[PDB]
Protein backbone atom coordinates (compact mmCIF):
# COMPACT_ATOMS: atom_id res chain seq x y z
CA UNK A 1 0.00 0.00 0.00
CA UNK A 2 2.99 2.36 0.14
CA UNK A 3 4.14 4.54 -2.74
CA UNK A 4 7.33 2.47 -3.03
CA UNK A 5 8.80 -0.66 -1.48
CA UNK A 6 12.11 1.12 -0.75
CA UNK A 7 12.43 2.98 2.55
CA UNK A 8 14.76 5.67 1.19
CA UNK A 9 12.29 6.59 -1.57
CA UNK A 10 9.54 7.34 0.96
CA UNK A 11 11.79 9.31 3.32
CA UNK A 12 13.39 11.22 0.43
CA UNK A 13 10.37 11.85 -1.80
CA UNK A 14 7.58 12.39 0.74
CA UNK A 15 7.44 14.60 3.81
CA UNK A 16 8.06 13.25 7.35
CA UNK A 17 4.37 13.11 8.37
CA UNK A 18 3.48 11.50 5.04
CA UNK A 19 6.30 8.99 5.59
CA UNK A 20 4.91 8.06 9.02
CA UNK A 21 1.89 6.47 7.33
CA UNK A 22 3.66 4.99 4.30
CA UNK A 23 6.59 3.56 6.27
CA UNK A 24 4.06 2.08 8.69
CA UNK A 25 2.44 0.21 5.79
CA UNK A 26 5.79 -1.40 5.01
CA UNK A 27 6.31 -2.17 8.71
CA UNK A 28 2.85 -3.65 9.23
CA UNK A 29 3.13 -5.50 5.92
CA UNK A 30 6.64 -6.90 6.36
CA UNK A 31 5.89 -7.85 9.97
CA UNK A 32 3.21 -10.20 8.63
CA UNK A 33 5.87 -11.78 6.41
CA UNK A 34 8.01 -12.44 9.48
CA UNK A 35 4.97 -13.66 11.42
CA UNK A 36 4.02 -15.86 8.46
CA UNK A 37 7.58 -17.16 8.05
CA UNK A 38 7.96 -17.77 11.79
CA UNK A 39 4.52 -19.39 11.91
CA UNK A 40 5.36 -21.71 9.01
CA UNK A 41 8.76 -22.59 10.50
CA UNK A 42 7.12 -23.49 13.82
CA UNK A 43 4.63 -25.60 11.86
CA UNK A 44 7.47 -27.24 9.93
CA UNK A 45 9.29 -27.54 13.26
CA UNK A 46 6.44 -29.80 14.39
CA UNK A 47 6.68 -31.93 11.25
CA UNK A 48 10.47 -32.28 11.44
CA UNK A 49 10.23 -32.97 15.18
Amino acid sequence: GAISSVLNDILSRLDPPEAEVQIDRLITGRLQSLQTYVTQQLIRAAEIR
Partner: protein, 49 residues
Amino acid sequence: DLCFTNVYADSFVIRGDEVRQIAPGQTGKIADYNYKLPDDFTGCVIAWN
Protein backbone atom coordinates in the same frame (compact mmCIF):
# COMPACT_ATOMS: atom_id res chain seq x y z
CA ASP B 1 -11.33 17.40 32.80
CA LEU B 2 -7.65 16.41 32.92
CA CYS B 3 -4.54 17.65 34.72
CA PHE B 4 -1.20 18.53 33.13
CA THR B 5 2.31 18.90 34.52
CA ASN B 6 3.09 22.23 32.83
CA VAL B 7 1.14 24.44 30.42
CA TYR B 8 3.11 26.96 28.34
CA ALA B 9 1.32 29.64 26.32
CA ASP B 10 3.46 30.88 23.42
CA SER B 11 2.08 34.31 22.46
CA PHE B 12 2.68 35.76 19.00
CA VAL B 13 0.79 37.44 16.15
CA ILE B 14 0.64 36.52 12.45
CA ARG B 15 -1.25 37.61 9.35
CA GLY B 16 -4.48 36.08 8.10
CA ASP B 17 -2.84 34.44 5.08
CA GLU B 18 -0.24 32.76 7.34
CA VAL B 19 -2.60 30.82 9.63
CA ARG B 20 -2.37 27.72 7.40
CA GLN B 21 1.41 27.43 7.95
CA ILE B 22 1.13 26.65 11.69
CA ALA B 23 0.49 22.90 11.81
CA PRO B 24 2.37 19.66 12.64
CA GLY B 25 5.26 19.28 10.20
CA GLN B 26 4.01 22.05 7.89
CA THR B 27 6.31 24.20 5.75
CA GLY B 28 6.23 27.96 5.31
CA LYS B 29 8.01 31.19 6.11
CA ILE B 30 6.85 31.37 9.74
CA ALA B 31 6.82 27.55 9.99
CA ASP B 32 10.29 26.45 8.83
CA TYR B 33 12.36 29.33 10.26
CA ASN B 34 10.36 30.91 13.13
CA TYR B 35 8.03 28.35 14.77
CA LYS B 36 8.08 24.75 13.55
CA LEU B 37 5.33 22.79 15.29
CA PRO B 38 6.47 19.28 16.29
CA ASP B 39 4.90 16.15 14.84
CA ASP B 40 3.97 14.95 18.35
CA PHE B 41 2.43 18.28 19.38
CA THR B 42 0.05 17.39 22.23
CA GLY B 43 -0.96 21.01 22.88
CA CYS B 44 -3.52 23.38 21.39
CA VAL B 45 -3.59 26.14 18.76
CA ILE B 46 -5.84 29.19 19.19
CA ALA B 47 -6.30 32.17 16.85
CA TRP B 48 -8.27 35.41 16.96
CA ASN B 49 -8.37 38.53 14.79
